[PDB]
Amino acid sequence: SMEQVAMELRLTELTRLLRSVLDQLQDKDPARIFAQPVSLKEVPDYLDHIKHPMDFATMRKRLEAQGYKNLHEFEEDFDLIIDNCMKYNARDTVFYRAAVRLRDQGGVVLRQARREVDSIG
Secondary structure: OHHHHHHHHHHHHHHHHHHHHHHHHHHOOOOOOOOOOOOOOOOOOHHHHOOOOOOHHHHHHHHHOOOOOOHHHHHHHHHHHHHHHHHHOOOOOHHHHHHHHHHHHHHHHHHHHHHHHHHHO
C-alpha cells in the first residue's frame, strides 16, 4: 500500500536522525569504553551481575536493521549502557567516571533530538 511505504519512509528518516545522534553520543566516549560488548571471555561472571548488556556496536546493528521504532526505544538502550556500567563498576573507577561523563554530555544531544523528532514528526 501507499500508506506502508509512507510509514517506511518515516522509519528511514528516523533511522537517519538516530544515526547522527548515535555518532554524536559515541564522540562523547573518546576512550571507546562503551564501543563493544563487555567480553564474557574476560569478565566471565558478567551476566550474573548485568541482565541486559548493551554497547554502541550492538545499538548500531539494531539501528541499521531499522530496529528502533521511536526515540524512546533508542534512549532505553543508551541508558542501559550507562546504568549497567554504574552498577558493575565502583565509583572510584575510570569506567564509572566515563559513564557519568557520557550521561552528562549525551543529555544535551538527546534533549535536542527529542525536539527534532517531535518537530519533524
